[PDB]
């Protein structure tokens, strides 16, 4: 099955393991994982983080044929399980110095969910995209500005975390995949660029 191919020790995830818009797996509600994790679930989560690290490394991305990315969900690999990975790098200053922290967010999350959020909405100014989608899709993807999430790590430890700004937007995009929701479902149907008053537009 797909899981067997992905967790082979020598196998690296690349664009060929990523399913396409139209595949029914992307519209299911993914199945909760149970703890303690199987070996396959543990390995999958590590290969997903490895994919993101490779995607962000100019050379490995070139070698493997990948573009830069900050989030991945197991449904996109044809695995209907509530596992996501997020990797959001901080940026160099104007003199070229590395940031104090390499990443503003770095996690493999099992069974994540939004437990509360702000009344205010937000959206990225430049819209969103998706590895499973090979269409230009314009518009503002309207999300919760701020969220409190819960999730479990690979050991089974529960975490509760508040997020805002770009990290909020990323985590929301990945949780949507495990609920069978696509980014363009949150784009206004008649004017993609419509702005209801009070929308926070992120730059
Ligand atoms: O397909 C992907 C990778 N990806 C590709 C574009 C993108 C935008 C946001 Br916001 C989050 C993730 C994104 N994640 O599910
Ligand atoms: Zn592969
Ligand atoms: Zn169940
Ligand atoms: Zn391990
Ligand atoms: Zn590597
Ligand atoms: Zn609500
Ligand atoms: Zn996505
Ligand atoms: Zn919500
Ligand atoms: Zn709770
Ligand atoms: Zn639409």
CATH number of domain containing 88: 3.90.45.10
Range of the domain at 201: 1-203
Cα distance between residue 38 and residue 110, in whole Å:
12
Taking alpha carbons only, the member of 87, 120, 119 closest to residue 104 is 87
From 84, 128, 180, 202, the mutation candidate for ligand 1 (largest count of ligand atoms within 8 A of CB) is 128
Number of H helices, E strands in the chain: 4, 8
Q: How far is CA 74 from the centre of its chain?
A: 10
- Phi, psi of 123, deg, nearest 5: -155, 145
Resolution in A: 2.1
User: 175, 84 in Cβ contact below 8 A?
Assistant: yes
- Beta strand pairing call for 147-152 and 143-144: unpaired
The burial of 40, by beta-carbon neighbours within 10 Å (0-12 exposed, 13-18 middle, 19 or more buried), is given as middle
Cα angle for residues 149, 126, 139 (degrees, 5° grid): 90
Q: Does ligand 1 have an atom closer than 6 angstroms to the CB of 130?
A: yes
**Residue 119 DSSP class:** S
Taking alpha carbons only, the member of 161, 155, 154, 142 closest to residue 104 is 161
Residue 128 CA: nearest ligand 1 atom is 8
Q: How was this structure determined?
A: X-ray
**Residue 81 DSSP class:** B
Residue ranges with strand state E in 55-102: 71-73, 83-89
Quick one: tokens of 117? 């959020």
The burial of 168, by beta-carbon neighbours within 10 Å (0-12 exposed, 13-18 middle, 19 or more buried), is given as buried
From 48, 70, 181, the mutation candidate for ligand 1 (largest count of ligand atoms within 8 A of CB) is 70
Cα distance between residue 79 and residue 139, in whole Å:
29
Residues annotated in a binding site for Fe cation = 130, 173, 177
Token pair 């309207």 in the structure block, residue: 142
Taking alpha carbons only, the member of 39, 19, 37 closest to residue 28 is 19
The Å distance, Cα 132 to ligand 10 centre, comes to: 17
Which residues are CB-neighbours of 120 under 8 A, at least 6 positions away? 144, 145, 146, 198, 199, 200
- CA-derived radius of gyration, the chain: 17
Structural domain count of the chain: 1
């Amino acid at each position: 099955a797909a899981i067997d191919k992905l967790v082979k020790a020598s196998h690296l995830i690349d664009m060929n393991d990523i399913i396409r818009e139209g595949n029914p797996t992307l519209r299911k509600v993914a199945e909760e994982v149970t703890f303690p994790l199987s070996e396959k679930e543990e390995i999958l989560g590590e290969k997903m983080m490895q994919f993101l690290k490779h995607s962000q490394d100019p050379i490995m991305a070139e070698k493997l044929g990948l573009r830069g990315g900050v989030g991945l969900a197991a449904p996109q690999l044809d695995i209907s399980k509530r596992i996501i990975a997020v990797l959001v790098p901080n940026v160099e200053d104007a003199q070229g110095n590395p940031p104090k922290e390499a990443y503003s967010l770095q996690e493999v999350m099992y069974n994540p969910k939004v437990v509360s959020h702000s009344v205010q909405d937000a959206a990225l100014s430049d819209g969103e995209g998706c590895l499973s989608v090979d269409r230009e899709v314009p518009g503002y993807v309207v999300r919760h500005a701020r969220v409190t999430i819960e999730y479990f790590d690979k050991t089974g430890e529960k975490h509760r975390l508040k997020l805002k700004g770009y990290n909020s937007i990323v985590v929301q995009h990945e949780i949507d995949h495990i609920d069978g929701i696509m980014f363009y479902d949150r784009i206004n149907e008649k004017n993609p660029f419509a702005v209801k008053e009070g929308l926070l537009i992120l730059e």
